Amino acid sequence: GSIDESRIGDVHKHTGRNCGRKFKIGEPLYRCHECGCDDTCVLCIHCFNPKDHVNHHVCTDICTEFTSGICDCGDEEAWNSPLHCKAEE
Ligand SMILES: [Zn+2]
Ligand SMILES: [Zn+2]
Ligand SMILES: [Zn+2]
């Protein structure tokens, strides 16, 4: 077999558990009007999968110092539809 060590690999994969990545200032936060339960359900850049949200109203935000957030990818009580983590691609 042959793997390339330079690749991002699987450092962002979180199969079976929630992502819970903490947003640092400047990073994008993704929210979907159709998929998210309340206006606090968010996805990180590594998780957000455009495929899941074709025809949906996606809202992007820049993370600030006042942003206290962790990624909700894989927490099934935060989403109306099952998501497909991008890190799995
Ligand atoms: Zn995430
Ligand atoms: Zn994910
Ligand atoms: Zn969506």
> Ligand 2 mean position to 17 CA, how many Å?
9
64: which 2 tokens? 């600030």
Round to whole Å and give the CA distance between 48 and 55. 15
Ligand 3 ion: residues within 5 Å (CB): 32, 34-35, 53, 56
Token look-up 């206290």 returns: 68
Residue 46 belongs to domain spanning:
1-89
Round to whole Å and give the CA distance between 18 and 33. 20
**Which experiment gave this structure?**
X-ray
Token look-up 């042959």 returns: 2
Ligand nearest to the CA of 23: 1
Round to whole Å and give the CA distance between 65 and 46. 20
Round to whole Å and give the CA distance between 57 and 59. 6
Q: What is the tally of structural domains in the chain?
A: 1
Q: How many CB atoms lie within 10 A of CB 36?
A: 20
Annotated binding residues for Zn(2+): 14, 19, 32, 35, 44, 47, 53, 56-57, 71, 73, 85
Helices (H) and strands (E) in the chain, counts: 0, 2
Round to whole Å and give the CA distance between 65 and 83. 28
